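A common beginner's mistake is to predict each chain separately and then try to dock the pieces by hand. The better habit, illustrated here, is to supply every component at once so that their relative placement is modeled jointly.
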Amino acid sequence: KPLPDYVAWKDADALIVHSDKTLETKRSEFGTSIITPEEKLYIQNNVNTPPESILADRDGWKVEISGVKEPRTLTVAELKTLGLVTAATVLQCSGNGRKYFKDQLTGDQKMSGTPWTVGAAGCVIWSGVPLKAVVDALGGPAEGARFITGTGGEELPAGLDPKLLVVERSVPISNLDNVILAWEMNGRPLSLAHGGPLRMVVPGYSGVNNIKYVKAVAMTEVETDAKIQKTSYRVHALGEKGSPDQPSVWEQPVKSWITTPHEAAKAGQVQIAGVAFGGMNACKSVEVSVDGGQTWQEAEFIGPDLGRFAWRVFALSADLARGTYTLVSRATDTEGNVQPEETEMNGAGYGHNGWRAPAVKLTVA
Amino acid sequence: KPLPDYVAWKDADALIVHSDKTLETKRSEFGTSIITPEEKLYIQNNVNTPPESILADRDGWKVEISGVKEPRTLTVAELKTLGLVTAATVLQCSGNGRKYFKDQLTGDQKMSGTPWTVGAAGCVIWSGVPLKAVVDALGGPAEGARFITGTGGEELPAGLDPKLLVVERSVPISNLDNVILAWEMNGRPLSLAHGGPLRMVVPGYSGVNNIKYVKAVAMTEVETDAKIQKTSYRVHALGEKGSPDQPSVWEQPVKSWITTPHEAAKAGQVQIAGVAFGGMNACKSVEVSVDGGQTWQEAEFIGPDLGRFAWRVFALSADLARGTYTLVSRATDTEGNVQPEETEMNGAGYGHNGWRAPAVKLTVA
Ligand code: MSS
Ligand code: MSS
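With all components supplied together, the output reads:
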């Protein structure tokens, strides 16, 4: 219930403490300014957070760059000379909406993992050096490179096989132009809790791929065979083990949810709003419904457009009689991908994006 | 020197404490994410802050709306029912850059006021209700209304004359479509120190016009004859008193400044960056010089475009020999307005937008 000390600075009234590695943002804390307040942003760690000592000398933090023509270790100071890129993305856990999959379980069916609803997601602005700039300074990728492979900086238990625990992820090299090595989040030096001193940011991809405290970036011909790539974070059926032939949780699908009002309103005029994104694509439109998706209304976007990888705020002005309403939203991206009512089951419960399950029940009085 | 209780949450290391009413953002603290961190945003109050008990019931805060067909006092709760808007604006004090006017003084020429350099400015995201929507809900503005007149909510000392102390400002009614009554900034409820529970935000206008803790908004045929509107905050010549025939500090002029590197760097590639806006218009382009304005090069914009009232981060990658450089930026807006080298003198020291004076001395080692 209380905050662990690596996130003592965070807002405890805005957060569900699932565990010391896992804090969820309450649905009524998102705001309507697009950007998620740092002190309310969700936390999800696969392993323990490093000590705060790694932030003592942020410019001295080292990144080994390999799979390029002139491989070498670059400090953050050095990276700060190579370029500057700023971009807003949706950082969302692949598990976000796992609760809703658990709700579809029947008989002897079981699913482990955090029962996230909507709160394992936030829209933030990163600043740093683009990966293309880093790779191009070292003579470009080695011929045959197919993947960008990032390695988390956590000290591993000297005892176990490191491939069992290391947070290492591999994404296609097509993402080279979007990837950022970010030292800054929302205009501040990146907190330890969200991956300081440097984090590999992979736009449009799921949370897991945005490697906190990145110490190595390799352009590689093969994905990492680390457990967290090979077998974990794989889309499979109920009762299947994860394996590297199945899709990995890479691109994020088109998705939205209602954020306000979360619970209660007076009868009359009500502003219904929430967040909507297309993952790799921009959100083009959101339809909103107050009767559980029986009747639909086009909503309008709110605030500026922060790019194809960020979310938009939407809103519908409703005039509601006294009753108990069922608020849902259905986003559509620029390529025509639209949220289904329910998301097809998968055993680990990754990538929920159905519109029915996250419905908000609104008592209008 | 220390921080007063009402801004004890702010980052002491990021702020120069001119007084208990006046805190300036250090030039090294702007970041490159566009948005200015809440805890680093500048503070500037003409009179004392209200007690924080006014935030105890934010939704019960009352705003009298007059100069419309159906004049009425609305609570914030009610305002939340009438619409939703979100926008990024540059919040800048009309005093920002006064030190640079004070440097142009010769002989017996004095100038009072805070010697701000570049840190009485921030770019933030406001969320709230559009004033148009509030005004439409109450039948529209009265026939012949020519101004929006906002009254700050500070308790006035009894005995004294209200008009000598009240923070009340008028802007032309042409701003109706842009004006927001904001309960939220950067995704959080608005802090007391930045005008919570409700602030009248006037995009593209100098800071004084953005009325904190707004308790009345009136569509008026004349400007308020309050002191702060009538004589204060007027562009007049060195030696003159202020008077209402003269231009008020309304629309912000085209402007930019370098924010990084602030002091030092190493020989070789150096990423020079800053912020740039057109006030009422977007920034179209920015040129940067390393030799005090002898040679210019086109910079490129960094991060998303947050709209016409916000600022763009810009950057220029330059390759530098060891030496002492003089970093300047010159911004152009969408209608062809460029920054001048120096700004024409005015007695109060308002509206400096010159490129020579805010120059950064870079020691490239
Ligand atoms: N280094 C590292 N990184 C990393 C990790 C760990 O553990 N480690 N986790 C993941 C995940 S998985 Mo699921 O797909 S979600 C997620 C994310 C989150 O983030 P924040 O905490 O910042 O929010 O992160 C990411 N990264
Ligand atoms: N109510 C009120 N409001 C108000 C005031 C006062 O005093 N009061 N001030 C002004 C000014 S002036 Mo010169 O032009 S700048 C400015 C601004 C600032 O804000 P922040 O503090 O938030 O930053 O505010 C504005 N508003």
